[PDB]
């Protein structure tokens, strides 16, 4: 039994194949000319009144969402469509092409945006297996990509694709690896450093002495959970960073050891700052250079923050002394530092002009007017054009080389100029050479010093909680996959901040909650957690709770292995009851993990499915997972159990597979946003259940009493007879052969 991962290789679409009849199922006009019917019904009408079955109907899906209701509407809608379609049967040899936007993660940079659409994928996948060569799934992030590609989409016979500008992608299961990604020393307190600089291959995770022991000064030791990656980190990795640097500066985590020389904050504390050599389970730094963590921030959203905002602050306050009314020019706007400055600048009451690449513009919250491409030098006369020089009072430049020159001709009036880039660094007096009026400082944030950083840290937080700065968009990765992340980073595909997360680790002190801890899997996992693993505080949770056979025994067993076990009756889909449960977890064993193993089953081809059945199967998986993530503390690890059925589209379980595909998508999106989430797509288990096991046993016991099972027809004729019949107590049974075992059975 392998573990599998679903990949999306590029495929080649046949470029010379015949373009086919097409109708559009949609609200509105088509820029192109192709038949449009607002709904399936109307396309029937045309068929009714003579029209010839189109080879392909396109059904672009209305935008979903990641909320229960969303999932509900957009699978229900998919069902009406699938059912309407199957029942016509003039629409045979014709194919329904359902289009989605962002239901599917294909490229490294990109997360699932529409969970509900991802549910759609599962359901339809099921139906595809039920009816081959009749439906086609297409994820296309911006439509009209579609039509050009359309004769190819159809000729390749492939039922599932995602269109990206890169290419067309098909999905397939793959073994883990394939190289096996990044391997860990397991001996805790390693780190990521570039071993063979020059190339991203030859990154590795090798044990680090420095982190482990001992403190300190001065110093405080941290159990890291996430860390920010900076552009710096990507150059270091490529033997292309002009200066001294150790991979990974900044992060957030939990305090382990403190002292000597430290009083302000103490162990257990959640903390973020500018840690050196950040990319490991264990690192240690100066307690003034780090600070405790605001709102209910995730460790991930904490880790993105420090470097970018310290720079922005240290740069715009200390070095620039930016005043209200004064205006600013910032490069790499949709980047972290670029992103940060514009936020802080708007607080400091400046006008702002800035630059990123055209594809990132939407992510800037700046009036069209003030924007410009960042890999050209056009901005100059457009901005100087935009405002008569004097142009900008201050410049926070990252673009070095010759892009840095067109910069300084902004702000001719005079003013201050800040350089970030070490390659082609300059001289202040020799800068005064080129332009009059302009002072010039080339800085590193660490320059401010521990004293100043801690003071800027305390001052930034204030702003964050004042709701005046908001942490950047996070796109997260697991340290073991850093190469994929740094490649992204160095290719400048991203917006906002990238972040690395450390391998998840449950507080051995803490509580673990298993939903559906009665079920075939939940019990086993429940047992394995207590009997083999650390776990010594359990909450189990199922609709019936302790009242279902044999849950009393199930508990006994564990509590007997010396554990603090609670089994509460609770429907996970009732947020009000879940809350009641979580709250009753004791303060000293606070929960660190959820195993969402709760589930309800259905069976039937998509023809036969109904809305009411759909919701049956959705309620524990979707509402439950939503309730959980809503209620759960951010950095509680969440393990969702889906089913391989959601991935193969097992058929017979359309609607179940929808639920499971949601879970798969919820994790993929959620880990991306930084939070500790993992989703396992179980194939079949041998196990059975307390259930079940107990029903089976009853059957043995009754047999072992030389009894035999009654057919249902006979059982009901007896029901009939015994109900209205003279004897008040009556044993309708079928015996076997002609029992010295039972005294009652004599004569």
Binding-site members are: 231, 332, 336-337, 357, 360, 374-375, 420, 443, 445, 494, 520-521, 542-544, 571-572, 599, 621, 642, 656, 685
334 binds ligand NDP, rule: CB under 6 A: yes
Q: Which is closer to ligand NDP, CB of 97 or CB of 498?
A: 498
597 binds ligand NDP, rule: CB under 6 A: yes
Question: Contact, 371 vs 364, CB < 8 A?
Answer: yes
Q: Which is closer to ligand NDP, CB of 519 or CB of 676?
A: 519
Selection from 51, 45, 48 nearest residue 21 by Cα: 51
Among 61, 126, 445, 592, binds ligand NDP (CB under 6 A): 445
Q: Which is closer to ligand NDP, CB of 97 or CB of 329?
A: 329
Q: Give CA separation, 486 vs 9, 128, 306, 591, in Å.
A: 20, 38, 19, 33
Question: Contact, 50 vs 630, CB < 8 A?
Answer: no
Kindly write down the DSSP assignment for every residue of 322-369, as one continuous string. --TT-EEEEESTTBHHHHHHHHHHHHTT-EEEEE--GGGGGGS-S-GG
Rounded Cα distance, 171 and 181, in Å: 20
Rounded Cα distance, 401 and 416, in Å: 19
Question: Contact, 568 vs 582, CB < 8 A?
Answer: no
Please enumerate, by residue number, every residue annotated as part of a binding site for NADPH. Answer: 231, 332, 336-337, 357, 360, 374-375, 420, 443, 445, 494, 520-521, 542-544, 571-572, 599, 621, 642, 656, 685
Q: Which is closer to ligand NDP, CB of 78 or CB of 597?
A: 597
343 binds ligand NDP, rule: CB under 6 A: no
Single out the segment in contact with ligand NDP by CB under 6 A; choices: 26-34, 91-99, 514-522, 701-709: 514-522
Q: Restricting to residues 231-260, which ones interact with ligand NDP according to CB under 6 A?
A: 231-232
Q: Which is closer to ligand NDP, CB of 243 or CB of 503?
A: 243
Residue labelled with tokens 């405002």: 387
Single out the segment in contact with ligand NDP by CB under 6 A; choices: 148-156, 171-179, 205-213, 677-685: 677-685
388 binds ligand NDP, rule: CB under 6 A: no
543 binds ligand NDP, rule: CB under 6 A: yes
Q: Which is closer to ligand NDP, CB of 87 or CB of 376?
A: 376
> What residue is closest to ligand NDP based on CB?
519
Q: Restricting to residues 611-630, which ones interact with ligand NDP according to CB under 6 A?
A: 620, 624
335 binds ligand NDP, rule: CB under 6 A: yes
Selection from 304, 279, 187 nearest residue 673 by Cα: 304
Task: Show the CA angle centred on residue 49, arms to residues 46 and 53, nearest 5°.
Answer: 50
Q: Which is closer to ligand NDP, CB of 134 or CB of 543?
A: 543
598 binds ligand NDP, rule: CB under 6 A: yes
Name the token pair of 659: 């639920």
Closest approach, Cβ 109 to ligand NDP, in A, equals: 12
Strands 251-258 and 270-273: antiparallel
Question: Contact, 230 vs 307, CB < 8 A?
Answer: yes
* Furthest-apart CA atoms within the chain: distance in Å: 122
Residue window 311-330: x/- pattern of binding to ligand NDP, with contact defined by CB under 6 A: x-------------------
Among 253, 510, 516, 649, binds ligand NDP (CB under 6 A): 516
100 binds ligand NDP, rule: CB under 6 A: no
Among 52, 165, 685, 731, binds ligand NDP (CB under 6 A): 685
684 binds ligand NDP, rule: CB under 6 A: yes
Site residue total, ligand NDP (CB under 6 A)? 52
366 binds ligand NDP, rule: CB under 6 A: no
Among 140, 337, 342, 563, binds ligand NDP (CB under 6 A): 337
519 binds ligand NDP, rule: CB under 6 A: yes
Selection from 140, 230, 301, 210 nearest residue 670 by Cα: 301
Rounded Cα distance, 488 and 481, in Å: 11
273 binds ligand NDP, rule: CB under 6 A: no
Residue window 275-314: x/- pattern of binding to ligand NDP, with contact defined by CB under 6 A: --------------------------------xx--x---
Rounded Cα distance, 479 and 501, in Å: 6
Q: Which is closer to ligand NDP, CB of 190 or CB of 641?
A: 641
Selection from 204, 248, 246 nearest residue 222 by Cα: 248
356 binds ligand NDP, rule: CB under 6 A: yes
Single out the segment in contact with ligand NDP by CB under 6 A; choices: 149-157, 341-349, 456-464, 513-521: 513-521
Question: Contact, 632 vs 592, CB < 8 A?
Answer: no
94 binds ligand NDP, rule: CB under 6 A: no
CB contact set of 662 (below 8 Å; sequence gap of 6+): 71, 115, 116, 118, 119, 122, 621, 622, 625
Look at phi and psi of residue 400 and say left if phi exceeds 0, alpha if psi is from -120 to 50, else beta.
beta
Single out the segment in contact with ligand NDP by CB under 6 A; choices: 10-18, 130-138, 628-636, 637-645: 637-645
402 binds ligand NDP, rule: CB under 6 A: no
Q: Which is closer to ligand NDP, CB of 75 or CB of 311?
A: 311
Task: Show the CA angle centred on residue 476, arms to residues 473 and 480, nearest 5°.
Answer: 160
Q: What is the dihedral of CA 433, 436, 439, 442, to 10 degrees?
A: -40
Q: Which is closer to ligand NDP, CB of 75 or CB of 230?
A: 230
Q: Restricting to residues 711-730, which ones interact with ligand NDP according to CB under 6 A?
A: none
Closest approach, Cβ 368 to ligand NDP, in A, equals: 16
Closest approach, Cβ 133 to ligand NDP, in A, equals: 27
Q: Which is closer to ligand NDP, CB of 99 or CB of 667?
A: 667
Question: 36 forms bridges with which residues in the sheet?
Answer: 24
3-state class percentages of the chain: helix first, strand second, coil last, to nearest 5: 35, 20, 45
Rounded Cα distance, 149 and 436, in Å: 56
Closest approach, Cβ 571 to ligand NDP, in A, equals: 4
Rounded Cα distance, 579 and 95, in Å: 46
Question: Contact, 521 vs 682, CB < 8 A?
Answer: yes
Tally: H helices and E strands in the chain: 22, 33
Helices 68-88 and 611-618 pack at an angle, to 10 degrees, of 140
Strand, coil or helix: 252: strand
Residue labelled with tokens 């680790």: 505
126 binds ligand NDP, rule: CB under 6 A: no
Return the HEC string of 76-93: HHHHHHHHHHHHHCCCCC
Count of other CB atoms within 10 angstroms of residue 487:
15
Cis peptide before 214 (omega within 30 of 0): yes
Helices 575-583 and 624-631 pack at an angle, to 10 degrees, of 40
Q: Which is closer to ligand NDP, CB of 77 or CB of 493?
A: 493
Among 251, 483, 646, 689, binds ligand NDP (CB under 6 A): 689
224 binds ligand NDP, rule: CB under 6 A: no
Give phi and psi for 539, each to the nearest 5. Answer: -115, 130
Closest approach, Cβ 72 to ligand NDP, in A, equals: 15
What residues make contact with ligand NDP under the rule CB under 6 A?
230-232, 307-308, 311, 332, 334-338, 356-357, 360, 374-375, 398-399, 420-421, 444-445, 492, 515-516, 518-522, 541-544, 548, 571-573, 597-600, 620, 624, 641-643, 682, 684-685, 689
């Amino acid at each position: 039994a392998r573990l599998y991962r679903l990949s999306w290789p590029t495929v080649q679409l046949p470029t010379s194949a015949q373009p086919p009849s097409c109708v559009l199922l949609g609200t509105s006009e088509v820029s192109a000319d192709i038949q449009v019917y607002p709904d399936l019904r109307s396309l029937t009408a045309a068929l009714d009144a003579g029209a010839e079955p189109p080879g392909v109907v396109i059904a672009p899906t209305p935008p979903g969402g990641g909320r229960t209701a969303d999932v509900r509407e957009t699978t229900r809608h998919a069902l009406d469509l699938v059912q309407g379609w199957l029942s016509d049967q003039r629409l045979n040899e014709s194919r329904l092409l359902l289009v989605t936007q962002g239901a599917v993660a294909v490229e490294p940079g990109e997360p699932v945006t529409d969970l509900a659409q991802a549910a759609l994928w599962g359901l339809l996948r099921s139906t595809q297996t039920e009816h081959p060569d009749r439906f086609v799934l297409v994820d296309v992030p911006e439509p009209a990509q579609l039509l050009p590609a359309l004769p190819g989409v159809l000729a390749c016979g492939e039922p599932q694709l995602a269109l990206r500008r890169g290419g067309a992608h098909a999905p397939r299961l793959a073994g883990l690896g394939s190289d096996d990604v990044l391997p860990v020393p397991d001996g805790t307190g390693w780190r990521l450093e570039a071993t063979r600089p020059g190339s991203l291959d030859g990154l590795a995770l090798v044990d680090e002495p420095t982190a482990t022991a001992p403190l300190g000064d001065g110093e405080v030791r941290i159990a890291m959970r996430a860390a920010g990656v900076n552009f710096r980190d990507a150059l270091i990795a490529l033997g292309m960073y002009p200066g001294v640097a150790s991979l990974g500066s900044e992060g957030a985590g939990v305090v382990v050891e403190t002292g000597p020389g430290v009083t302000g904050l103490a162990p257990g504390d959640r903390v973020m700052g500018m840690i050196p050599k950040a990319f490991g389970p264990l690192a240690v730094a100066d307690h003034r250079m780090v600070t405790r963590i605001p709102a209910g921030w995730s460790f991930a959203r904490a880790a993105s923050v420090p470097i970018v905002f310290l720079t922005a602050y240290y740069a715009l306050v200390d070095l620039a002394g930016l005043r209200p009314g004064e205006s600013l020019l910032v490069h790499s706007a949709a980047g972290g530092v670029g992103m940060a400055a514009i936020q802080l600048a708007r607080h400091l009451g400046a006008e702002v002009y800035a630059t990123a690449s055209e594809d990132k513009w939407q992510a800037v919250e700046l009036s069209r007017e003030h924007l410009a491409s960042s890999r050209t030098c056009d901005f100059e006369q457009q901005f100087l054009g935009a405002t008569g020089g004097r142009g900008v009072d201050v410049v926070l430049n990252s673009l070095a080389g010759e892009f840095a020159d067109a910069s300084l001709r902004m702000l001719p009036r005079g003013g201050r100029f800040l350089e970030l880039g070490k390659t082609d660094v300059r001289d202040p007096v020799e800068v005064a050479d080129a332009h009059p009026g302009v002072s010039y400082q080339a800085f590193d944030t660490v320059e401010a010093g521990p004293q100043r950083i801690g003071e800027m840290l305390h001052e930034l937080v204030e702003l964050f909680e004042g709701r005046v700065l908001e942490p950047l968009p996070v796109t997260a990765w697991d340290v073991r996959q850093a190469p994929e992340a740094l490649r992204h980073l160095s290719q400048a595909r991203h917006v906002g901040k990238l972040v690395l997360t450390m391998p998840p680790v449950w507080d051995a002190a803490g509580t673990v909650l298993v939903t559906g801890g009665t079920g075939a899997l939940g019990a086993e996992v429940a047992r394995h957690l207590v009997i083999e693993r650390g776990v010594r505080n359990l909450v189990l949770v199922s609709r019936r709770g302790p009242a279902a056979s044999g849950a009393a025994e199930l508990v006994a067993q564990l509590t007997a292995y010396g554990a603090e076990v609670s089994l509460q009756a609770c429907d996970v889909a009732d947020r009000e009851t879940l809350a009641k449960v979580l709250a009753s977890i004791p303060d000293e064993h606070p929960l660190t993990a959820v195993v969402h193993a709760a589930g309800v089953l259905d069976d039937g081809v998509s023809e036969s499915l109904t809305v009411e059945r759909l919701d049956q199967v959705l309620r524990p998986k979707v509402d439950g997972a939503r309730n959980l993530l809503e209620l759960i503390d951010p950095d509680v690890a969440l393990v969702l159990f889906s089913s391989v059925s959601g991935v193969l589209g097992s058929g017979g379980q359309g609607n179940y597979a929808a639920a499971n595909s949601f879970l798969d998508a919820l994790a993929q999106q959620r880990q991306s946003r930084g939070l500790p989430t993992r989703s396992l797509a179980w194939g079949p288990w041998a196990e059975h259940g307390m259930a079940s096991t107990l029903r089976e046993a009853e059957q043995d016991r009754l047999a072992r009493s030389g009894l035999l099972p009654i057919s249902t027809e006979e059982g009901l004729s007896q029901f009939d007879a015994a109900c209205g019949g003279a004897h008040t107590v009556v044993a309708p049974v079928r015996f076997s052969r002609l029992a010295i075992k039972f005294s009652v059975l004599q004569g």
